[PDB]
Design a protein around this ligand. Sequence first.
Ligand SMILES: Nc1ncnc2c1ncn2[C@@H]1O[C@H](CSCC[C@H](N)C(=O)O)[C@@H](O)[C@H]1O
Ligand SMILES: Nc1ncnc2c1ncn2[C@@H]1O[C@H](CSCC[C@H](N)C(=O)O)[C@@H](O)[C@H]1O
Lengths: 110, 110, 610, 610
Amino acid sequence: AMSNMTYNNVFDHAYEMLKENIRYDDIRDTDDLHDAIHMAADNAVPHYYADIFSVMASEGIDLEFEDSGLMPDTKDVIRILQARIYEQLTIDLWEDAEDLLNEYLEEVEE
Amino acid sequence: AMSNMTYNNVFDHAYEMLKENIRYDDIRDTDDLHDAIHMAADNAVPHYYADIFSVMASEGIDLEFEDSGLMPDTKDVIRILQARIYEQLTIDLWEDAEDLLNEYLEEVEE
Amino acid sequence: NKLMNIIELIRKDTGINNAIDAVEQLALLLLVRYTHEVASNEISKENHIDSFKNLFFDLNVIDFYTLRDKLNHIVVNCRFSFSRNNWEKIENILDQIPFRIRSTKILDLVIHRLEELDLSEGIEIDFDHLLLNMVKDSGSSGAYYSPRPLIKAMVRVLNPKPLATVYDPAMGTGGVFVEAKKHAKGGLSFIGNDLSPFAHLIGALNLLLNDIDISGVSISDSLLDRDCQQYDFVISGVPFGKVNELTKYEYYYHGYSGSLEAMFLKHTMDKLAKGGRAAIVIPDGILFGNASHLDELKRQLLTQFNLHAVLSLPKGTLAPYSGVKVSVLFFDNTVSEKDIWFYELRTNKPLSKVNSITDSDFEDFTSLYERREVSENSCLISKESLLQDKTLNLSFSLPKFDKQEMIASLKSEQLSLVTSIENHFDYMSLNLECKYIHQVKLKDICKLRSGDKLNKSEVMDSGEFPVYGGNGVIGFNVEPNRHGDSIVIGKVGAHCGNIHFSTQPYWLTSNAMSLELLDTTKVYLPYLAHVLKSLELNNLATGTAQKFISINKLYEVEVSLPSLEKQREMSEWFTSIEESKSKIQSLLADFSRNLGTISTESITEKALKG
Amino acid sequence: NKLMNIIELIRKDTGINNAIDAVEQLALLLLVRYTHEVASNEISKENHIDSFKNLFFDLNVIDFYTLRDKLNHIVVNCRFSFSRNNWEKIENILDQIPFRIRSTKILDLVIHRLEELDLSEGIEIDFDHLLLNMVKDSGSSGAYYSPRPLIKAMVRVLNPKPLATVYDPAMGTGGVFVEAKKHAKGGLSFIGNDLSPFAHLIGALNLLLNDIDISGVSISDSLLDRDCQQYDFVISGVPFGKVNELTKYEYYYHGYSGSLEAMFLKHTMDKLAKGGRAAIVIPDGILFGNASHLDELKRQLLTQFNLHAVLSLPKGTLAPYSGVKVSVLFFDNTVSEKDIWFYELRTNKPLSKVNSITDSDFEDFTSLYERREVSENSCLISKESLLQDKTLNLSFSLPKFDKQEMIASLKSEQLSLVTSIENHFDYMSLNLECKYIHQVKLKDICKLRSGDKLNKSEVMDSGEFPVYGGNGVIGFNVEPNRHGDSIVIGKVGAHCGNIHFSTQPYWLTSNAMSLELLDTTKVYLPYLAHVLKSLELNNLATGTAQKFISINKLYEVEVSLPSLEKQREMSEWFTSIEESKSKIQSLLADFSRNLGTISTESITEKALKG
Ligand SMILES: Nc1ncnc2c1ncn2[C@@H]1O[C@H](CSCC[C@H](N)C(=O)O)[C@@H](O)[C@H]1O
Ligand SMILES: Nc1ncnc2c1ncn2[C@@H]1O[C@H](CSCC[C@H](N)C(=O)O)[C@@H](O)[C@H]1O
């Protein structure tokens, strides 16, 4: 128990920040989303030991990285896990972000 | 969620194995408990990724080792955590084991 | 023992070949006495019909010719109801083996020594002592004789059933039949053959002394089949190949070079009955792989007959007659579906000259003959494995390390250690001058655009097409994203800012960004790759849980570059010093751990005996 | 300009000291004409009372003596209602400065040149051009003269309030009062003093030409106080120390070695009023730390007066007169609770000989005088820091790297690299023979008992008492568990089986087990420690999530050991080769990364200009 925070709790925190980031900053260029999704993901990542394990124990994530180069190459599991939850947040936000930006611009279409 | 297994679930599994190990094998020598508590602790340690994190997220354990030499010196967090839960099981069983053996021998006293 | 005095009595008149002529004359007289002494109790008894005794040798002076006629006369009176029915065999030996003694003084003493011998359980074990003492003294006499401890062990592992017909293509002295009878003491239809008349005399006489029927023994050429039939058991110690007069004589045995041990191997295979086991002692020279004409022989033998066991006999078990290394095959016909057992015999000291082979050394082989897995000196080998090889070699061996050579090779690593670092040292001190013509910004020189994220669809180990991620090369997708062969930089990883140069098209992951120059007239990509590597782009990145480089922040990076003529000259200097750094440190890491294992295992060398 | 022709007219009769005697004679005649030309319009006007003009020099021939009497007569008629009340000062200069021209031809031409000069806004800027052209031509004339650009900048940063009394202990030419009047042009009670009569003549004359009252100017010794009082402003360019005739003359100034720049520093401190700011130009030779007798001066100055700013002036700002490096202090009395600002002035080229100091170089210092933090050429230093040091040094400096010396030291590391590995190579090839006397078991030689678990009560960084855990030494508890100085082995860790030898008592954790020998007559503990290290005890351990060594399984371990005489000889060989392994690999790791940083930073050297 200890922490009720889960990955989908963290993801909704990162997803709604992207809803706020996209609308306030326009970011019509699709390459500006990379700087945008990172700010929502980086800020949503927890830093406490109870929050990291409770998120890691919940559904939606593994210890397996999609990219091996993103592994921190360190002996601290805390850093490896917070880099791990971040890696999933970026690729989980990615599929919903492009659609989120596509239907956001209701000002040039009807 | 995923796994309902906690540390105190794992500890009770390791504690009751020591109750069984102590009674069946006599082990009157206090240095035979070291080989005894290890068998209860080693067998109680989980090996699945969902069970390890769910135990790590529960109460009773940290990522901090009591002995630094017991750190596996590896980049795999799975091995570090299963060595971590084991390290706590040995020192958590230790205080209750000596008493458990003391009141076990009701055959030479009344 | 008693027979040795007879050999010493036979002296002057022959007086040239004491080795075998004395043994030949003794066996000639001993066989004549055997028939006479056997005929005495067969029908003569006493007085009912009386027979003159031992008077044929000195009939009339010496007349060995008249002895042959009186010996026939004795048998004529006997034929009134072995030896007697097939008297032609015993009568033929008198024709083939001639008498040579011509001294009455010498002949008088031996014949009186002959009548003293008691043939009831006495002459048997004194004849083999004579036979054994002959081959050690004559050497060449070992051609017709094989070690009794070898024969005793061979016949024991054979275990002949009472309902069997043991056959020897070269009966020699008949030691196999003697051991076969002794092995089954607590009958077998023995068959034999031989070419040399002396061995036929010695073999027939020795079989009679052990009370063994000599009805199957004959004198003929075994390689020449004439017309023959298989037998239940075939055990022999075959000889060694020669074609002195037999060069063109064995025409129908085509393919062979006149090898006796090989032609007899073909003979034993033809003369082995269905379900019949066998054991043939052969030299190692004919079971090797280079024996081209014999590879067909080993091929059919391994294909048909069940060759399941071979025993390695040390060089040279076969007496002073030959120092060659020999071995005994065990092909039992039937089906060949079984792996080959192998035993390797070892003795306390080299043999042959003196202290030869003993029956104590065969004790392990007899007990473990049917137990396949045995430690130390025996093993099991596969049939199809050596049949599948290029050449079929039957010379099997046993399948069953820190030295001072390690420092010798470790000194060579130190030779290569200084070889390159001194070259690396002085190649770094060149200091080639250069002046920068431009001082541009990354904003207005190249195009920086990151790729999209791939869903881990393909990540092949090998491929003609690569994929670049946040750091390093991971993945081999078949679809390119950036057709240009340009520069890529990591963006989102903890090792972001890594500069990787691509010489071929690829696909760009969302974890990296592609740099493609706007005008090729200003910058040489490898020079820009090194100068971007020199800027340490990881300081540009910001973040808490992860480090991230923004595309806008990379545009604002200033880079000073010289002329294209100089950029290639500097890039070639920059790339060479970099390769030496990676290689020298890599060899240092190998050399660092190799010195650790060399130093530890050398310590364990003197602290542990094993 | 016009005055230079007068200097050229003064020629032959003096005719030895064209440098200063000509300037001295000109200023003597120029001052006499000033009084005469001022007296003409003061009371003479025209005809009401008429005054003879320019007739005293050639009165009667030449009679400079008679000129003094007629000059007095002119002033007597003027006194019927500066210069006139204190006429004794102007009359004293005539006594001190004598006339030397004795040629009527030469005197006739200069006096007619004198009357041509118009004193209305004309003679002023031609006199300083004469003064400036004199010190560059004479050098020694710079003793009484300081650079006008220096004075202009000093008085600007002073910013004298209208209600102030500027004082100069060495008024010299009076350039400070001229710049103070010019600075406040869009009065100040000027006070001055000087010893040399020539500078008193030049200073008083130059102050009159700029229409500045000379009532405070005098001729006396400033170091000799007599009786004096403080003033609001004290600005001066003090001279350099000498005691030619003044060796025993300045007795009451005890402690000093006769240093003018130091004694005047004591004078300016005594003559600075409460709340009064000051600026004194001093050479750098007297603000160093080795000035022992002056350390008391700097100590009281830094303790009382607010020395808050020092300006570094390049060597040698002070003209061809002296090439020494000078600096200007800024102690404003009041309270000393403020850190010292520091400006370092730099010019385009060395000065003094030609192209001397300019007022353009001081532009930065004037603007940033009250802005403490300024880039490049200025900084701020602490007061208590240098006061706390051993010696008080006021020579401040600015507080604001890959070379080919790295390979030079990297070659030395390679020198040490082969130095030890070749020694390590040949020390491993000794192969000292040894024979094992015993072949015992760990069961019957030592006592293996593990310790209990400590609750992390004490884990001090340092201590006289150690604690051994599963691997390595962690903890420094004050209570021992095993008093014996024996061998410990790891048990439960992943690095279990590690052999650690203890030379002193300790406490044993539950993660390790203690080995204590039963009989000291058989084994040498360091030899057993190496032979237990050689056995690789990690194979003995079993477990899944963790590796664990059982106490019973360690008892069953066999170890062969030799004699005690040999065990110590082997242990010393074993320990030495082990230490070299750890050291050489450690230096390899340092050398491996050091070559990487040397190779990279050398690449960045030629790819980046900065
Ligand atoms: N063409 C041939 N046919 C048969 N035997 C031959 C032969 N050429 C040589 N040999 C025989 O091979 C024998 C040597 S082997 C003797 C071993 C004997 N079987 C024993 O039990 O001790 C000699 O008898 C020799 O004459
Ligand atoms: N005992 C003393 N008392 C006063 N002044 C002295 C002295 N000894 C030397 N000096 C003077 O120090 C002066 C050199 S400093 C001249 C600088 C002058 N204040 C200016 O504004 O340009 C000379 O006047 C010299 O005579």
